[PDB]
Amino acid sequence: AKSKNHTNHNQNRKAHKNGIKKPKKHKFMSRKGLDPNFFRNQKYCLKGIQKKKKELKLKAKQEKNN
Amino acid sequence: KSRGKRSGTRYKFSKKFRKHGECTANKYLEKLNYGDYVDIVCDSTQQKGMPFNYYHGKTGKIFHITKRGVGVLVNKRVKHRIEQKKVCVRIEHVRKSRCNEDFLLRKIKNAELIKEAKLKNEHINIKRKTEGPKPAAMIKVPPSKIITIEPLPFY
Amino acid sequence: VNVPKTRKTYCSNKCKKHTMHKVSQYKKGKERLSSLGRRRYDMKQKGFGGQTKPVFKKKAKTTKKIVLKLECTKCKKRFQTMKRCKTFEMGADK
RNA sequence: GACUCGUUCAUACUACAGUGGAUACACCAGAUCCCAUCAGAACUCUGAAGUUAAGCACUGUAAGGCUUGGCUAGUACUGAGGUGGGAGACCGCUCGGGAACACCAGGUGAUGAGUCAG
RNA sequence: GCAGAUGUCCAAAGACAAGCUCAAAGAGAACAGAAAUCUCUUGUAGACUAAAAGGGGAAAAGCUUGUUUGAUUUCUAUUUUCAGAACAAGUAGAAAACGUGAAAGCGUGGCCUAUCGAUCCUUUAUAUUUGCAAAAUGACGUAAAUUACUUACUACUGUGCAUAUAGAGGUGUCUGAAAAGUUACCACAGGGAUAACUGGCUUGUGGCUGCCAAGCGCUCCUAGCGACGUAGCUUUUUGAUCCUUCGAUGUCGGCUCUUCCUAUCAUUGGGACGCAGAAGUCUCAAAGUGUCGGAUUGUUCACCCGCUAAUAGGGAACGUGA
RNA sequence: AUCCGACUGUUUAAUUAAAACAUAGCAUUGUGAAAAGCCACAACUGGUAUUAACACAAUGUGAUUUCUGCCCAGUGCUUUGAAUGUCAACUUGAUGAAAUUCAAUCAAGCGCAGGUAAACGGCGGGAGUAACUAUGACUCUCUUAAGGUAGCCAAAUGCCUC
RNA sequence: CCUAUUAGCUGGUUAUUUUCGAAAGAUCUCUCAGGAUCGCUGGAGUUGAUUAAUAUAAUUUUACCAGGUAGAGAUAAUGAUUAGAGGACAGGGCCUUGACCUAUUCUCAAACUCCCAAUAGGUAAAAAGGGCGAAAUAACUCAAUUUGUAUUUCACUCAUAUUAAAUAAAAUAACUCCAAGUGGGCCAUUUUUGGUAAGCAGAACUGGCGAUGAGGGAUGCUCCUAACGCUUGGAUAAGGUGCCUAAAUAUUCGCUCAUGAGAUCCCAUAAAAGGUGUUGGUUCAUAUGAACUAGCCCUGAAAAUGGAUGGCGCUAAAGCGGA
RNA sequence: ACGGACCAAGGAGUCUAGCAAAUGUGCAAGUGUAUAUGAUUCUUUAAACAUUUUACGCAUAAUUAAUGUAAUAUGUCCAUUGUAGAUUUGUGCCCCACUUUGCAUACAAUACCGGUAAGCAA
RNA sequence: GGGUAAUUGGCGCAGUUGGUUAGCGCGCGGGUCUCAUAAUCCCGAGGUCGUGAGUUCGAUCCUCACAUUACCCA
């Protein structure tokens, strides 16, 4: 029995019935494997700034908590 | 029956007339930053680091930079939805865009105008004009320049 | 396809210096009679029933992948794979 | 006037004539050493006896080409509408957008950074 | 559908650097010619680049030379087919040690687009990684101690076997069953998704009617014709399709019987003719009347004998099996 | 009168009575007996057989007449094998601490060398040539195993074919 | 008896109403009548809106992009492809044959392009953001522990009262989970492949049919108007106004004699060629001759049950084309 | 195109095991009381009731073939860090802008455990 | 895959450490009349490469080149 080998009819209407879906567009994009030896430095940067901020936080907390 | 890499680029990837030869020796010197908007143009003089069939002419943004590679994020349609796609291309093919120079110029004009506008405390319709209905005015024309028109005969 | 017999390359283990390597052509080697597959198949084949497994009896393509065994002169071995070809020889005339 | 490094990558090109030589580039003298060949022709090295003849710079050609503008022409063409016309092929109308080739006119560059010379 | 091609080939046809610039045409020079070597002039590819084709390529991606093996180990982000699975093929990187040039850089095969393959099983390599279910196999090795069931410290621990990682052995029906025919003795479930018969829509072929007029017709284009070309009707052949029925529409032909159509064979009345008359040819109005007996053959179709006035062409589910 | 079948006979109960079968004749093969043939049987055992080559079993063709041409390359079937290629178990021997791994051969069969076509089957293609013409008695040629012999015919076997 | 064997296949599969409501693609399949898969749908539940915003939009605009289809060409390349004008290697008797060269000429290309549309395509149009300086951090980079890069915290503040263009019954959103059906399609305007053509075979953007009736086309699965809770009035769409058949023998302006007139797209055929029929024009010649030109009409015009603009019939139309 | 001359009765998504999801309920780092045990229960009672100070399943911790190994790390009963984000306390008993807390979650970043790489390695 | 012979003159042939040899194919001479034929000589990677040994085609060894066998968890 001969069978229709292809069609693309009604496909666009089916697509637009639910509306063309958009990606969620989140804010941050992961750095799992992007250009290392730069984020390698950046992680140490973040660790250092966090360490300074948190040690100052603990110093203030102690000098206010006696 | 055949859907290879460069399929159907007999003219698209072909370099335009009298534009053969290697890429311009200044296109390497453009400056790129994360978050910039960029256009993707497939050149053919360079071979490796090549974009693909569909992506010629599209836009995107810069999120990945290597010694020579550039990764651009693009919205490519597939049936019922749009999904992000990251494409890695080379500096020869990539090209700085103009999709945001209009808005950048508008922002610069805003910064250099509304500053003094606020200094004077004036409100303006800083929204884009989109000129529609023209106003009504009076104009002059002497009777010596009114040239009539009439339909033409056949031949 | 002709390949020089001795090469200069990297050693993937026990060493980290670009040294000499002797190149030979890998051979399949006779299957062991005590191997698990053979003994299990023999156990299956005891008794009536005939063949109890398919036979790869199609014979479609006309060549085998070519593989080079590299001997690191210091010690130890390594494999390498070249694209399939019909003709292959060791260090033939230049 | 001159050069060096650039951009613009033919208005910057090409063919033919004329003009310009203090440093300028350049032709030019040579091959012991660095250096290369079949060949000091080229390349490399050392020089400045002679030099606008050539390159290079400028100008000229009812020069070709190139490049703008006009015209080709609202023509060819085409989106939407039509219980429009035509047996059909095709051709009107409303709301719309809009060519190219050939032809004519004008032009043959602009330019950054740095230096020498007076 | 169309024009083709692939299941290979290559230590260089791979990497890099440097130098040079190809075809062709003209001009010239012993043998020497259309072509043989050299040199000159012009020369944006008209050659060359493994293959088919399509792109790209000029101080090169081509030609010549030089040094070389990055055609290497391991791992990510991803693009193409897309389920946005994979493999595959790539693209960009990273951690290594290298080659190349002076460096900048470039190198993860072939300037780009095709050149290829799961599970399980087998085999070969790698491994300060393991077991072989109460135990051990260097080795009593080392320090002390005595005639013993002595004590501390050991990375190097029997054959064979299973694993872990990595390639390879092919599944071309190529996302992967190990596989010869026949039923005219047949059986079953189904199919008008699907043949053979009408019916249908189309008219290529078949038949029929035209248009134009070079020539034929003693001269004379249209009495009768009419090539070379061109426009239509037909469903009476064969075609093309498979829209209707495979829970059955009784599929050839002959016998018999009725009507209908006209593109008239004869008969009616005319017209024309290259018509003396006769005979005959073309043709307009015309379906009222008529279109036969036989031999051969299953025939339709066909060919003969004979009379005829003439022995015209067709349909009706190829008319007609209660 | 022709074709078929030699005749009498048998057969598709309920669509086919024949040209189908069988028969007499012709010819082949196996078989010397209980250690054989053909066959049945799970094993014991049995039929042929109360049998003995003028017999038993399996075959093809089908009175009589005259014939029954050629090929053992193909596939079958069969005959000889201590020279013999290949080939199992077992055994022997070697190494090994043992499993193990290795070599050797006087099994049959296949191969080697024969025979057999009333075993299955097969039986050519091109050119040139003779006082008219046409053909080809013959010559050359490619090739197979031989290349359709005696005979016969648009036969119930010839499409072209009416 | 195993056995109520198996069956990708046929037939059937029982009460209402309401709400929502499809597909006949695409990948793989010893797959082509099946299946798994996403895609389309329902149900459930959650986060965000309820503040004429922000996300958001089959939308347009402002700016900025990319293409090589029609079209246009042959002198712009390649391949064709027709004739001459002119001009200095070979053949024979200044002469001839050609080839060859310069500029012209006739016509082309789904697998030609110096050029290039409309359609369709893409991105940006400011607050989880940006602009403008300091202070820290780093093992990254740079000659630079101070060159920068990126980060954090502070400064300062960028229309926000219409809202960084317009307009938006834009939060009827976004997400997650469970699941059925589906996985043979077809018709229509336009584009287009094969074939002569087909109510054929095969695709393309969109709409329908299926899944759907209502009025009209006499009648019809797809045409036109228009999509449906149950009634009462008004006024319409398409379409009609001689009767059938509700409404104009309505008005007004011209054409038409048919001894087979004509009367709506799909839609149910008609041509090449003609006409001294008639109506109106244009070009020429001295109200006349010719040549053209387009409306209607006539010929061309032939098929079988008896036949159809739907019938009747229709001519100062109830035909044709208008107002 | 196929089944239906007619009537009345019968006539088809059920049951079990296992899992998942949705919902409701109890309990909650525990949960279920299994076989089975005791009782002046012993028509109905083949059901209800009850279960002396680790029985098991499922969960609390994962991972690798595997010998096995096993979640910050003792500065502190703070309980990792960001961007938003519900609430919250207040300034200008009902809006918006200003500081305060930052649920849940969403997108990330960090550490830490097993595994495999790489460097070292007694 | 195993196992074996084969491929060396132009035919075909077998040979093995102190070796390249012939019957035929070819050349001419000479010859016994015309044919045979003594003998010179054309003819040899001893299928290929490498290896072993005072001394090799030979001894060891792999590459493909030819054919019945046997297994086709390949």
Side-chain angles (χ1 to χ4, degrees), chain B residues 5 20-22 66-68 76 79 83 85-86:
Chain B
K5 301 288 95 175
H20 298 264
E22 295 291 334
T66 81
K67 303 172 293 197
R68 269 88 163 86
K76 184 249 195 176
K79 297 173 193 178
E83 50 195 0
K85 280 167 178 276
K86 332 176 195 74

Side-chain angles (χ1 to χ4, degrees), chain A residues 1-22 24 27-28 37-38 40-42 44-49 52-53:
Chain A
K2 181 79 71 173
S3 70
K4 165 171 299 290
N5 276 94
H6 166 68
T7 193
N8 196 48
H9 180 73
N10 189 26
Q11 277 308 126
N12 218 356
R13 172 201 321 282
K14 271 159 64 180
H16 289 240
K17 175 73 68 66
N18 202 8
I20 179 64
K21 186 69 71 69
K22 311 290 303 201
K24 322 186 201 74
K27 173 138 192 175
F28 303 99
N37 279 313
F38 168 72
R40 183 158 296 168
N41 163 45
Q42 189 54 255
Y44 309 143
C45 300
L46 189 64
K47 214 181 302 172
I49 175 61
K52 179 170 177 177
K53 203 180 74 45

Side-chain angles (χ1 to χ4, degrees), chain B residues 3-155:
Chain B
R3 38 185 177 271
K5 301 288 95 175
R6 286 183 90 182
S7 303
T9 67
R10 187 185 207 278
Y11 320 125
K12 192 210 318 294
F13 282 17
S14 67
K15 200 62 180 170
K16 265 185 296 308
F17 196 57
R18 281 154 61 189
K19 309 305 152 196
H20 298 264
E22 295 291 334
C23 165
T24 300
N26 207 8
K27 195 156 181 55
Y28 296 102
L29 267 171
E30 280 70 341
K31 184 178 184 293
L32 270 75
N33 287 330
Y34 285 137
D36 271 321
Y37 282 85
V38 72
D39 293 333
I40 172 167
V41 174
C42 181
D43 188 294
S44 298
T45 65
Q46 166 55 262
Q47 319 309 326
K48 292 185 186 293
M50 211 181 84
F52 293 98
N53 63 7
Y54 171 86
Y55 275 73
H56 185 80
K58 294 310 197 64
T59 62
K61 58 183 281 208
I62 307 293
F63 79 98
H64 194 197
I65 292 175
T66 81
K67 303 172 293 197
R68 269 88 163 86
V70 161
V72 180
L73 189 68
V74 176
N75 295 335
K76 184 249 195 176
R77 187 183 184 278
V78 62
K79 297 173 193 178
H80 88 91
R81 68 176 196 272
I82 310 299
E83 50 195 0
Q84 304 270 28
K85 280 167 178 276
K86 332 176 195 74
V87 290
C88 312
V89 307
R90 211 172 168 182
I91 306 153
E92 303 83 310
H93 302 137
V94 68
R95 147 189 279 171
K96 63 181 176 293
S97 170
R98 292 179 180 177
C99 295
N100 308 61
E101 72 175 359
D102 189 332
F103 169 61
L104 273 180
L105 195 63
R106 211 196 328 158
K107 287 213 305 283
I108 297 174
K109 170 176 174 171
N110 294 293
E112 61 88 19
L113 197 146
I114 294 89
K115 178 62 182 66
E116 186 76 26
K118 181 195 282 187
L119 188 153
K120 308 304 293 173
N121 181 239
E122 322 303 331
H123 191 50
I124 202 63
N125 291 110
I126 204 56
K127 48 185 58 58
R128 202 138 59 260
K129 214 56 165 187
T130 61
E131 185 269 328
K134 295 182 184 293
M138 201 55 98
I139 77 160
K140 293 281 290 296
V141 65
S144 291
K145 296 181 166 179
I146 46 173
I147 318 295
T148 185
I149 189 167
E150 63 268 14
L152 273 296
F154 193 66
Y155 291 101

